[PDB]
Design a protein around this nucleic acid. Structure first.
Ligand SMILES: CCCCCCCCO[C@@H]1[C@@H](O)[C@H](O)[C@@H](CO)O[C@H]1O
Ligand SMILES: [Zn+2]
Length: 793
DNA sequence: GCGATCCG
DNA sequence: CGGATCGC
């Protein structure tokens, strides 16, 4: 076999499907059952595959009205997939097919004709087989075993039969054999098709009592294999994915495009029955990225390289001890919502993350490390183990990373799954009432601005606003940052914008975010993804709910405990600064946290040489500002700017600050010193982050990297500390019948039963407070309440 | 000092 | 498509 040729009877499959699924249409009218039916059966054949694919069409009058519309889509689709389209003018589609089949077969190919019209069974041979839509491969064996015939005498058999419209009314019977129970029996000596006179009624009677009719039934052999055509059986070309998506989407069937990819999948590797060997990397494909709201379609597992596919995804999950592989945590969250407790084990995504945090998505790391993130469960599971091997062999030598992996990240994956799976209850009545309120407010703003501008210009349309501003007695980047002057209108628009963004980001999405099966929101939490090592949240991003602002507080208020439960919000007090005191070891900073005093007030004294009890507001504010600034950069230029009044005496403030805290500065120094030498910095626990730009050419960016270099150790250590705390806390939490729900900034929020709350709150405080030993003490401020704002921090 | 998820 | 706010 030089190759496999799949001849598709586009002509008839199109007609068939038009009368199949008859009601199907895109909710807008536009019927689509023919297009659908045709695509669906086409995929099946292509799943089975072939090298060349030729969909033959006819080259109208008393045919269906809407049929041509869908037929054009049929051809368009055929083309979009890279398959060949063939319609010879003045030739019936079946004659062309019979010939393509024969020519290819002669040319040493193996041919499979995707069709349903029984006529083609006459071509049927070794090498030439038929593929019926419904199913079954039709072969010569099939024919002899099911009909008792051979292709060479099937065109004949059917001649004296009829099927549909192959008109032949009147068969009689004879021994109740009719014509069907008969059929084969007249093969022994023709009569109708050459010699034989006297014979039994019907069989011969009806034969002669029906001239003309045979001179029509001849259509059965109307499968001439000798039509001279040129088309070559070349392999199907590259499918126009960009348009194919658009196509399927125009028809509303974009959602099934997933299967269309499943044909360009590289040659399959060895397989085995479902149950996989202990420790096989799993793979999976979901209907949507968000696991809680996802349909698990396809579960697979590779071990050794043999890939195993689960016949039944949703049940196979019970055959696994753990979900081990790319996106484990996500599979577990789903298994959890399926009443199955499937533990997330190893995951290449975690090892990759550790090696270098510029590894966040499974599409990225896979591409980076010699692979690709496909959509097939098998392919994915294979990639998964392959990656694991590779990334482990590296990380393994790394004793700091390896500790981080086994003790923090990997155990953290299981903790996250549960939070995602459990979720939080929202006060949707409060939420809806809130939306109603914020709405009126945005209005007030819109009005105010139109009042100033005069002309009721449609705000929220960059280009019209640009105009309006530039006559009010760009924006992106430039004036967006610079959207102010001695003008109230700019502020009014700025308040309108935030009230809207908060609205269209938290206030509105929230209700839909409530899962029907559980009655609560499931904020997705991600381990990798950030640059410092912090946990990012999505749907919603809790991280971006404004803190301390009335609107922010009003928003949090929506998250509530479960009826007879209370929420316990535990916040780490200045964890970043105590981490600084520790990392730098600046005995003064250390001293303050040790004495248990208001670091700001203290920093003020040592800066303005006055007793703690003498430090005035402006004093402590400068101190607080400097303190916060230390953490990310603040230059000096910013410092003054922020402190507003400081006329470059800001440099004075900084010097005084480092004078009191000399080691803090020595830390900045060393940090950058080693960083720009080693190529990276690290957190207290060895979490590595590369900052190549510390040696950047454009000082503008060399500045930025500087920031990151010391910023990562501090924020980074804080990130690790929390992750580890959650890892220790989780177990004891389940013991107490309590539950972890969120994690935002340096906070953790638990839901616990009524008065269990007090015990739970204390246990949590202790665990967190004593997570990991540090120079300065770790302080956890806890709050217990009914709504998130009740607990507060 | 830039990010993270959503806007529009 | 690409950019911004709250975030730390
Ligand atoms: C413990 C109390 C110590 C004294 C608190 C006030 C210190 C101010 O001391 C001065 C600053 O005024 C000046 O800006 C810089 C320039 O280097 O010199 C500092 O050392
Ligand atoms: Zn046909």
């Amino acid at each position: 076999p030089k190759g496999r040729v799949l001849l598709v009877d586009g002509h008839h499959l199109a007609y068939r499907t038009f009368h199949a699924l008859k009601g199907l249409t895109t909710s807008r009218g536009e019927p689509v059952q023919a297009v659908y039916g045709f695509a669906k059966s086409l995929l099946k054949a292509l799943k089975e595959d072939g090298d060349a694919v030729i969909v033959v069409f006819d080259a109208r009058a008393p045919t269906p009205e809407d049929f041509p519309r869908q037929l054009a889509l049929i051809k368009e689709l055929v083309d979009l997939l890279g398959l060949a389209r063939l319609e010879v003018p003045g030739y019936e589609a079946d004659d062309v097919l019979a010939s393509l089949a024969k020519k290819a077969e002669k040319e040493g190919y193996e041919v499979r004709i995707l069709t349903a019209d029984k006529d083609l069974y006459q071509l049927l041979s070794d090498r030439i087989h038929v593929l019926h839509p419904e199913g079954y491969l039709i072969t010569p064996a099939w024919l002899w075993e099911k009909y008792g015939l051979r292709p060479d005498q099937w065109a004949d058999y059917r001649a004296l039969t009829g099927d549909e419209s192959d008109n032949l009314p009147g068969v009689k019977g004879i021994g109740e054999k009719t014509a069907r129970k008969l059929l084969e029996e007249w093969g022994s000596l023709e009569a109708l098709l050459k010699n034989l006179d006297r014979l039994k009624p019907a069989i011969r009677e009806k034969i002669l009592a029906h001239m003309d009719d045979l001179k029509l039934s001849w259509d059965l052999a109307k499968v001439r294999t000798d039509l001279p055509l040129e088309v070559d059986f070349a392999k199907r070309r590259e499918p126009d994915r960009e348009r194919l998506r658009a196509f399927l989407e125009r028809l509303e069937f974009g959602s099934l495009l997933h299967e269309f990819g499943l044909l360009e999948s590289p040659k399959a590797l060895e397989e085995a029955p479902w149950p996989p060997p202990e420790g096989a990397f799993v793979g999976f494909v979901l209907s949507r990225k968000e696991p809680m709201w996802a349909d698990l379609l396809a579960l697979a597992a590779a071990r050794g390289g043999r890939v195993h596919r689960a016949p039944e995804p949703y049940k196979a999950l019970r055959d696994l001890k753990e979900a081990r592989g790319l996106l484990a945590k996500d599979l577990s969250v789903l298994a959890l919502r399926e009443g199955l407790g499937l533990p997330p084990g190893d995951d290449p995504m975690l090892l990759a993350y550790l090696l270098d945090p510029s590894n966040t998505t499974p599409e990225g790391v896979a591409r980076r490390y010699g692979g690709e993130w496909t959509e097939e469960a098998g392919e994915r599971a294979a990639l998964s183990e392959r990656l694991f091997a590779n990334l482990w062999g590296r990380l393994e030598g790394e004793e700091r990373l390896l500790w981080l992996y086994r003790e923090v990240e990997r155990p953290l994956s299981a903790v996250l799954a549960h939070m995602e799976a459990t979720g939080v209850r929202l006060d949707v009545a409060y939420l809806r009432a809130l939306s109603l309120e914020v709405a009126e407010e945005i209005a007030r703003l819109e009005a105010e601005v139109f009042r100033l501008a005069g002309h009721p210009f449609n705000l929220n349309s960059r280009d019209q606003l640009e105009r309006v501003l530039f006559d009010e007695l760009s924006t992106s980047a430039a004036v967006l940052e610079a959207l102010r002057e001695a003008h109230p209108i700019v502020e009014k628009i700025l308040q309108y914008r935030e009230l809207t963004k908060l609205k269209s980001t938290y206030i509105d999405p929230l209700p839909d975010l409530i899962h029907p099966r559980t009655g609560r929101l499931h904020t997705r939490f991600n381990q990798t993804a950030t640059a410092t090592g912090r946990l990012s949240s999505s749907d919603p991003n809790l991280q971006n709910i404004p803190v301390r602002t009335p609107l922010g507080q009003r928003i949090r208020r929506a998250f509530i405990a479960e009826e007879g439960w209370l929420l316990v919000a535990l916040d780490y007090s200045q964890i970043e600064l105590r981490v600084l005191a520790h990392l730098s070891g600046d005995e003064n900073l250390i001293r303050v946290f040790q004495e248990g005093r208001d670091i700001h007030t203290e920093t003020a004294s040592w800066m303005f040489g006055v007793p703690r009890e003498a430090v005035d507001p402006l004093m402590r504010r400068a101190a607080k500002t400097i303190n916060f600034g230390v953490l990310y950069g603040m230059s000096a230029h910013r410092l003054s700017q922020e402190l507003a009044i400081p006329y470059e005496e800001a440099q004075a403030f900084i010097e005084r600050y480092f004078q009191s805290f000399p080691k803090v500065r020595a830390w900045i120094e060393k940090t950058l010193e080693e960083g720009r030498r080693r190529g990276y910095v690290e957190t207290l626990f060895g979490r590595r982050r590369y900052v190549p730009d510390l040696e950047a050419r454009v000082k503008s960016v060399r500045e930025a990297a500087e920031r990151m270099a010391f910023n990562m150790p501090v924020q980074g250590t804080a990130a690790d500390l929390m992750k580890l705390a959650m890892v220790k806390l989780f177990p004891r939490l389940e013991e107490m019948g309590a539950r972890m729900l969120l994690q935002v900034h340096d906070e953790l929020v638990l839901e616990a039963p009524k008065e269990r709350a007090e015990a739970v709150a204390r246990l949590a405080k202790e665990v967190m407070e004593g997570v990991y030993p540090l120079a300065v003490p770790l302080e956890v401020e806890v709050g217990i309440g009914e709504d998130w704002l009740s607990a507060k921090e």
